Enzyme design. Structure first.
Site, mmCIF file in Angstrom:
data_model
loop_
_atom_site.group_PDB
_atom_site.id
_atom_site.type_symbol
_atom_site.label_atom_id
_atom_site.label_comp_id
_atom_site.label_asym_id
_atom_site.label_seq_id
_atom_site.Cartn_x
_atom_site.Cartn_y
_atom_site.Cartn_z
ATOM 1 N N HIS A 68 0.389 11.102 -2.815
ATOM 2 C CA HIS A 68 -0.436 12.207 -2.250
ATOM 3 C C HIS A 68 -1.643 12.493 -3.149
ATOM 4 O O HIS A 68 -1.854 13.642 -3.545
ATOM 5 C CB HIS A 68 0.422 13.440 -1.985
ATOM 6 C CG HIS A 68 1.244 13.314 -0.760
ATOM 7 N ND1 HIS A 68 2.601 13.089 -0.809
ATOM 8 C CD2 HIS A 68 0.896 13.316 0.543
ATOM 9 C CE1 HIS A 68 3.065 12.994 0.412
ATOM 10 N NE2 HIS A 68 2.030 13.124 1.267
ATOM 11 N N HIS A 72 -5.237 8.330 -1.269
ATOM 12 C CA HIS A 72 -4.703 8.696 0.067
ATOM 13 C C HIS A 72 -5.789 9.445 0.837
ATOM 14 O O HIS A 72 -6.024 9.121 1.991
ATOM 15 C CB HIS A 72 -3.425 9.516 -0.070
ATOM 16 C CG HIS A 72 -2.962 10.130 1.205
ATOM 17 N ND1 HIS A 72 -2.524 9.375 2.251
ATOM 18 C CD2 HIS A 72 -2.841 11.419 1.592
ATOM 19 C CE1 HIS A 72 -2.132 10.173 3.235
ATOM 20 N NE2 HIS A 72 -2.316 11.430 2.852
ATOM 21 N N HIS A 106 -7.403 16.987 3.244
ATOM 22 C CA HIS A 106 -6.203 17.417 4.013
ATOM 23 C C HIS A 106 -5.000 17.607 3.084
ATOM 24 O O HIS A 106 -4.077 18.290 3.507
ATOM 25 C CB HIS A 106 -5.889 16.456 5.171
ATOM 26 C CG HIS A 106 -5.154 15.233 4.749
ATOM 27 N ND1 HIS A 106 -5.777 14.190 4.103
ATOM 28 C CD2 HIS A 106 -3.852 14.903 4.850
ATOM 29 C CE1 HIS A 106 -4.878 13.267 3.814
ATOM 30 N NE2 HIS A 106 -3.686 13.676 4.258
ATOM 31 N N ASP A 107 -4.996 17.005 1.894
ATOM 32 C CA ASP A 107 -3.868 17.095 0.924
ATOM 33 C C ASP A 107 -4.354 17.633 -0.438
ATOM 34 O O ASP A 107 -3.653 17.403 -1.450
ATOM 35 C CB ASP A 107 -3.174 15.741 0.773
ATOM 36 C CG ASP A 107 -2.070 15.438 1.783
ATOM 37 O OD1 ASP A 107 -1.351 16.367 2.200
ATOM 38 O OD2 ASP A 107 -1.916 14.244 2.128
ATOM 39 N N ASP A 217 -3.377 10.152 8.931
ATOM 40 C CA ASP A 217 -2.495 10.544 7.815
ATOM 41 C C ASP A 217 -1.418 9.483 7.607
ATOM 42 O O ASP A 217 -1.108 9.211 6.446
ATOM 43 C CB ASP A 217 -1.884 11.911 8.069
ATOM 44 C CG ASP A 217 -1.324 12.534 6.813
ATOM 45 O OD1 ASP A 217 -1.723 12.094 5.700
ATOM 46 O OD2 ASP A 217 -0.524 13.468 6.964
ATOM 47 N N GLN A 269 13.130 3.134 7.053
ATOM 48 C CA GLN A 269 11.786 2.758 7.583
ATOM 49 C C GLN A 269 11.857 2.470 9.088
ATOM 50 O O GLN A 269 10.937 2.929 9.817
ATOM 51 C CB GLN A 269 11.195 1.573 6.807
ATOM 52 C CG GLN A 269 10.695 1.970 5.424
ATOM 53 C CD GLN A 269 9.674 3.074 5.529
ATOM 54 O OE1 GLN A 269 8.528 2.850 5.915
ATOM 55 N NE2 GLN A 269 10.093 4.286 5.206
#
Ligand SMILES: Cn1ncc(NC(=O)c2nc(C3CC3)cnc2Nc2cncnc2)c1C(=O)NCC(C)(C)O
Ligand SMILES: [Mg+2]
Ligand SMILES: [Zn+2]
Length: 313
Positions: A68, A72, A106-107, A217, A269
């Protein structure tokens, strides 16, 4: 005014493709972002002095966490660039401006921990924001950086355009809360299937922009297998650290975050591709046909995880 950013030939060509990896050279990422703003928006959208100051302040407020992080931020912004460039006429000038900044921001100030962990820890941010905890914090950090002297990249917008762009960015960033994605995609599914989906309906555009934000994202699952496989290690490095911290609060974490259950990752996953990623890129492809390469690359990576399970790697 006449100062373009230019990339080396290989980047100039590959940056246009959905599966582009921004590379290991951190010092090229700001330039890659300005390159995208100039082609997506125009050389006049932002004062370059102010954009450069905004970019470097945003970079400073991303932490050195395994996933994060600043890489990213720029990766998610590139996926938005590719969606916008393949859907030229569907988006306003304000939406192109807002969404590239939304993705970069956004993060902001992510600590590597989920909304759940903040709540169980009893972090102050969980008292201030009862839902979408980190996402309300990310939008907060965005407004803070915008209000530093010399950092307001929107200053040349009219009062009402300014309020519209901050509202685009707020909804865009809140939508990156994956707890909200499930219901948002279901509504967009129903609306597409029953034919009520109307892009002149503002509440409809909002939902569509929200899905784009989820798609950008999660876009690490849409890269070439070697990129996706190595990014998976980074996000599991955070999940396992959170599992460790859950155990320190005397809570058994979910298997996703338990580093004792690494064997279960391949099947974990599969679930994630089937429950989250494949549905997200399917609904996005139905609404925005030119985003099909994200769905195709995602399916390729599901198939690679099926091969891992079957002992073929
Ligand atoms: C049960 N599970 N196993 C795994 C997993 N999540 C992921 O692997 C994953 N999550 C995210 C966002 C949510 C934080 C982003 N990228 C991710 N994976 C990834 C893989 N390869 C490259 N890059 C990224 C879930 C889950 O988050 N399930 C969704 C929910 C918790 C709502 O059930
Ligand atoms: Mg986030
Ligand atoms: Zn993110």
């Amino acid at each position: 005014g006449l100062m373009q950013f230019t990339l080396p030939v290989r980047l100039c060509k590959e940056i246009e493709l959905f599966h582009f990896d921004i590379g290991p050279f951190e010092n090229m990422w700001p330039g890659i972002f300005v390159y995208m703003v100039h082609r997506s928006c125009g050389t006049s959208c932002f004062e370059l002095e102010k954009l450069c100051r905004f970019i470097m302040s945003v970079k400073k407020n991303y932490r050195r966490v395994p996933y994060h992080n600043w890489k990213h931020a720029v990766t998610v912004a590139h996926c938005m660039y590719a969606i916008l460039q393949n859907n030229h006429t569907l988006f306003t000038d304000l939406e192109r401006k807002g969404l590239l900044i939304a993705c970069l921001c956004h993060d902001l100030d992510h600590r590597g921990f989920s909304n759940s962990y903040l709540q169980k820890f009893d972090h102050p941010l969980a008292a201030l924001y009862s839902t979408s905890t980190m996402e309300q914090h990310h939008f907060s950090q965005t407004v803070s950086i915008l209000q530093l002297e010399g950092h307001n990249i929107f200053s040349t917008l009219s009062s009402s355009e300014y309020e519209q762009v901050l509202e685009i960015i707020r909804k865009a960033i809140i939508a990156t809360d994956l707890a909200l994605y499930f219901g948002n995609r279901k509504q967009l599914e129903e609306m597409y299937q029953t034919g009520s989906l109307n892009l002149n309906n503002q509440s409809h555009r909002d939902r569509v922009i929200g899905l784009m934000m989820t798609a950008c994202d999660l876009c690490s699952v849409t890269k070439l297998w070697p990129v996706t496989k190595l990014t998976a290690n980074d996000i599991y490095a955070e999940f396992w650290a959170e599992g460790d911290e859950m155990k320190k609060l005397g809570i058994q974490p979910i298997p996703m975050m338990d580093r004792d259950k690494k064997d279960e990752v391949p099947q974990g996953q599969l679930g994630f591709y089937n429950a989250v990623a494949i549905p997200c890129y399917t609904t996005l492809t139905q609404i925005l046909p030119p985003t099909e390469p994200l769905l195709k690359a995602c399916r390729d990576n599901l198939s690679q995880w099926e091969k891992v399970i079957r002992g073929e790697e």
